[PDB]
Amino acid sequence: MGRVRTKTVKKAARVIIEKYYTRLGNDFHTNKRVCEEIAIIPSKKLRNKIAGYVTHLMKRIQRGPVRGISIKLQEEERERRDNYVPEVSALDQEIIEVDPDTKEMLKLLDFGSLSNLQVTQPTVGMNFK
Amino acid sequence: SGALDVLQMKEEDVLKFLAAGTHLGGTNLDFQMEQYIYKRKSDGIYIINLKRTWEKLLLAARAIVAIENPADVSVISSRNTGQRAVLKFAAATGATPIAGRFTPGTFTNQIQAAFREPRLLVVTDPRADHQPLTEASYVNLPTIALCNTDSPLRYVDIAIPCNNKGAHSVGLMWWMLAREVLRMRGTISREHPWEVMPDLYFYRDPEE
Amino acid sequence: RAKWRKKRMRRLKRKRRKMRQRS
Amino acid sequence: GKCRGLRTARKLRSHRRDHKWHDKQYKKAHLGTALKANPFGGASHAKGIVLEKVGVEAKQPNSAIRKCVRV
Amino acid sequence: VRMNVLADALKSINNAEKRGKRQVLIRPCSKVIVRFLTVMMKHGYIGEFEIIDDHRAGKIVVNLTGRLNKCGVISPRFDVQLKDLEKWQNNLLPSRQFGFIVLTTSAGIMDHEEARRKHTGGKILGFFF
Amino acid sequence: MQNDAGEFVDLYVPRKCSASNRIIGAKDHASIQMNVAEVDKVTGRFNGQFKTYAICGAIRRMGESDDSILRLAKADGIVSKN
Amino acid sequence: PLAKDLLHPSPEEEKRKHKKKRLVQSPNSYFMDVKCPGCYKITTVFSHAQTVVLCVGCSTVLCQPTGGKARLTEGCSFRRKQH
Amino acid sequence: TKKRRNNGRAKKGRGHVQPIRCTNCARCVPKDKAIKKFVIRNIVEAAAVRDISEASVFDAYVLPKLYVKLHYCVSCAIHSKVVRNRSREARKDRTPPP
Amino acid sequence: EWMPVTKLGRLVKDMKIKSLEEIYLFSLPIKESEIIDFFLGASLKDEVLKIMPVQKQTRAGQRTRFKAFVAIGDYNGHVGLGVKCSKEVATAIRGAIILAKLSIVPVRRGYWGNKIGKPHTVPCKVTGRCGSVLVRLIPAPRGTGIVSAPVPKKLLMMAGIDDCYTSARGCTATLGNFAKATFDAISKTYSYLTPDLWKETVFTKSPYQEFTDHLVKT
RNA sequence: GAGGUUCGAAGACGAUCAGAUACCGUCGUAGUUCCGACCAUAAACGAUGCCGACUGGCGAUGCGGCGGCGUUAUUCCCAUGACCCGCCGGGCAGCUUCCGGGAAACCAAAGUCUUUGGGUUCCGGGGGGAGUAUGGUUGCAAAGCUGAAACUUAAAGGAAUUGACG
Ligand SMILES: [Mg+2]
Ligand SMILES: [Mg+2]
Ligand SMILES: [Mg+2]
Ligand SMILES: [Mg+2]
Ligand SMILES: [Mg+2]
Ligand SMILES: [Mg+2]
Ligand SMILES: [Mg+2]
Ligand SMILES: [Mg+2]
């Protein structure tokens, strides 16, 4: 009403956190004068006003990670998730669910593979105008 | 590409294609793709000819390989199913990736952070990531695509006919391209299979 | 309007028929 | 469209004939009126007697008196 | 209705080569068609055409190449008196350096160059260039 | 463009689409020229040379290009008999 | 698109073309050499019949005519294959 | 400047087609033209539903519905906010979206 | 001094590409006016066509902003047209030259009929047309000079057409698309598909492809 | 000539308004209703002449045909018939696109046009004066059809742009 934040704050705030995630915390008056160290914020109002999102983005972070955000742990976290994999993603054990026509495609190929083929039901088609 | 002998279709390969369902097309059919289909079943699902599907796949290989400097091949995905994929062929070949937003004239603009005058696109869906194709009209950009049956072929050098719908299938193609592009020239025997699995290539939904 | 001047003249000419026909 | 045929030299001539009584610049020249109407009977100049001197008031945007002669 | 069977055909073989069509068939066929297409064959303006013999009229199937910019037809066959042949080939062809007014004289159907070597006039048909 | 003295005038000879034989613009920016590699014949491996291969804008914006790539490629022995 | 070998059109894609539109105009009709149960006699019925085809014998009636092909009566065979 | 390709009208393939006088201004309009709401309003409404369901001699009871085919001339359609007045791109989008 | 950001830019300043015919050949977008400044140093004399003041209307008076057209050419093959609108005349002009410079093309010139000497006119009768207006360029035997209105004469004289009779109509007053129609006239000389061409292209590498070693710079 | 259901020019009052011989009200004649003659015009409008050729998609639907893969039913099947899935001809239509058009709006056609002519019909040549005067003709008449000039006149107009006022 009185206070929604300006983009000098929203941008600087988000950019401190991108660069000092470890330095900050979920208090005000601590990270309040962290900002005095790591930046040259001229006015006390702004200096103080900036630790605004510095908190409102930690309260967000613990609950969840931002869809677009700057972070070191998250990037590190993402790499770990990517490495994990099934030994074969597409192996699908033995026996694929294959249409008779699909079997026909193989025959033109002339390849021979294991597989039972089932076709069933009326040709209903898709959708109900 | 038309693998007259050695770089033929094989059997271990085919089972992947069936397993992921890369041949199971969409219900509908953009005519440019009636070269690359054999039947529709009942229900109304079209069936891609894994033979043509591959020939084409090599055709893109021949063309990427052609590129002397491998890091001037843009590799796009805007839909998420490729997001992971593209990064991973890009890392395998040493090509250059764009996942998420095809950002404003990275092809046009001598001022934006990103421009790039890449010498070949590769794209997951022409349907979705359909700027870069169109910006590829203003630079002399050939263009590989991972088309479906339902996909327009405005501005494509070459269409690889696939599913490009279920993440599972997408990855495979981003594999096989990656695979062939390193088999051709690079650093694989032909005789032996990879260190690299598919599992690396086709995205994960929020799972753990 | 158009309709109400085509209807002006088709009243006015009818007065010149009447005026003329006297002589 | 146009008639275009090969024994159509008349339908053409006679077409391009009447579709000149819809030209303006010829219906001055070839009709009659002009010679009949212009005091200058088709003649470049003409002589006449000054019967009085009359000032004419110019058309609104330019105010002034023009100083002419009734001939 | 079908008045002039050239205009018919030539529209449809200009009007493919714009689209870059590889080859086209021409529905009505005729002698005059063949005889004027074989002229186009010599200066390169098309490739080999292969006339079907539906028992009635004829169909043709024209191998096109890229090379034909336009072919058209002068519809009434005016009688060209050899002195006019220039005045025509001025205002009906893009230059004096190529372009062919096919016409039909005493000694067969042929381009304007060949009527000039034999020194004959006759009736204009069309032009390709 | 020769003249009397076989003299090749004209400051360049343009490229020319492979698919339509239609001359490709000075400022036709939706042009292509796809380079496609061949192999050794036996193992695999791009070693050797090159199937260069051009296409105009119009054919691209029509939607064809890939129809018209294949047909050329399989004439040139790269692709074969699907 | 840009390459349809019109002169050598595959057999399927003439049968999905209106009779006169084909590469060569041929019909889409036929005669059938018809049995019927009583008599052994075979009549030479033309599919697209127009009239009612009566038996060379007498009593039975072979083909009610309809819009397109003729309606064969109840239990009687036919033979395309020729020409 | 043909505004609506269609002409706000929905004729095509005909000629004079039944006119119908509106349910408000009493103003005459074609059948293909004209906005055509069809209200299935409950009789009792939202409030009284439970007054009447108490006082009912009968048990449960579904209650009926009025099936009115409203049927406005465009004047009253716009004045009384049935349709509105859209952008050039929007004029086309003929779907009916709740 | 340069800082060529475009690769095509980089290749130009290190005596890498020899003649812009090597660019046009592959249909590459020039996007740095200085390129054409390498490659046609001197020559390339630049004539303003018109300074027409457009002006858009607003709550308080009218925004008035100028539109400069400039023609560019070297009386020898290459010509261009640049149209830049700006708040000020000198900005417009200066920054229209920058576009004209960019959008220069080569004009193919041919021959009256007798095939002798050097090329004095247009090969075919090309046409070019910009919104109503249209201009036809007819071939021309030597000595005839240019036979047109002022404006197409000032673009054709620049192209190094020596002779041409034209035929133009529409709203020829509207200078912009007097000049822009007869831009696309002289663009479409090199798009004219004649027997003289007609030989399958030998084909050549590409600047990006030959010199791909120097772009990944050493 | 028959008839008078409503509505309803004209027409009568009540209001509204500075006024309303208007709208908004209340009456109600001709007519709207029928049968018999005339009249011969619309924004009679897709503001797109008719025939004929050619050039892209993609969906739908009316009719007919053809083919198939369905089943609800319908019976032992059938024939059907009703749905489904295709193809084919010709119908009414839709969307979509840098064909190509198009001043523009837009247009599978307004596409094939300085790369000018498939056949043919009509018809416009700045705006008014004027669809007037006059002449002829048809009509019982309203009017219909044919249809000028002197004079005056510099723009009138069309498509899209910002404005700005509803
Ligand atoms: Mg008296
Ligand atoms: Mg009507
Ligand atoms: Mg009466
Ligand atoms: Mg009243
Ligand atoms: Mg009328
Ligand atoms: Mg028109
Ligand atoms: Mg014309
Ligand atoms: Mg006039």
Residue numbers in the entry:
A (entry chain SR): 1 to 129
B (entry chain SA): 2 to 209
C (entry chain n): 2 to 24
D (entry chain SX): 2 to 72
E (entry chain SW): 2 to 130
F (entry chain SV): 1 to 82
G (entry chain Sb): 2 to 84
H (entry chain Sa): 2 to 99
Lines from the paper:
The majority of these proteins are recognized co-translationally at the ribosome by the signal recognition particle (SRP) and targeted via the SRP receptor to the Sec61 translocon for insertion. In eukaryotes, SRP is composed of six protein subunits assembled on a ∼300 nucleotide RNA. The S domain is involved in recognizing the targeting signal and interacting with the SRP receptor. Its functionally essential SRP54 subunit contains three modules: an N domain that interacts with the ribosome near its exit tunnel, an M domain responsible for signal recognition, and a G domain that (together with the N domain) coordinates receptor targeting. SRP is anchored on the ribosome primarily by its SRP54 subunit near the exit tunnel and the Alu domain at the ribosomal GTPase center.
A parallel structure of SRP bound after the TMD has emerged from the ribosome revealed the conformational changes that accompany TMD engagement by SRP. The overall architecture of SRP in the engaged binding mode is very similar to earlier reconstructions of this state visualized using heterologous plant–mammalian complexes. As expected, the Alu domain is localized to the GTPase center between the 40S and 60S subunits and is connected by a flexible RNA linker to the S domain positioned at the exit tunnel. The hydrophobic groove of this domain is occupied by density consistent with an alpha helix of ∼12 residues, accounting for roughly half of the nascent chain's TMD. After fitting the density corresponding to earlier crystal structures and assigning the substrate, two additional regions of helical density were observed abutting the TMD. We therefore posit that these two additional helices, provisionally termed αC1 and αC2 of SRP54, serve as an intramolecular ‘lid’ that surrounds the hydrophobic substrate to shield it from aqueous solvent. Density for two additional helices (termed αC1 and αC2), which were not part of the earlier crystal structures, represent the C-terminus of SRP54 and would be connected via flexible linkers (not modelled) to the remainder of the M-domain. These helices enclose the TMD substrate, minimizing the exposed hydrophobic surface area. After nascent chain binding to the M domain, αC2 would occupy a position on the opposite side of the hydrophobic groove, oriented with its hydrophobic face toward the substrate, forming part of a protective lid. In the engaged state, the SRP S domain is able to remain stably bound to the ribosome via its dual interactions with the exit tunnel and nascent chain, ensuring shielding of the hydrophobic substrate. By contrast, the engaged dataset contained a small subset of particles in which density was observed for both eEF2 and the S domain of SRP bound in its canonical location at the exit tunnel.
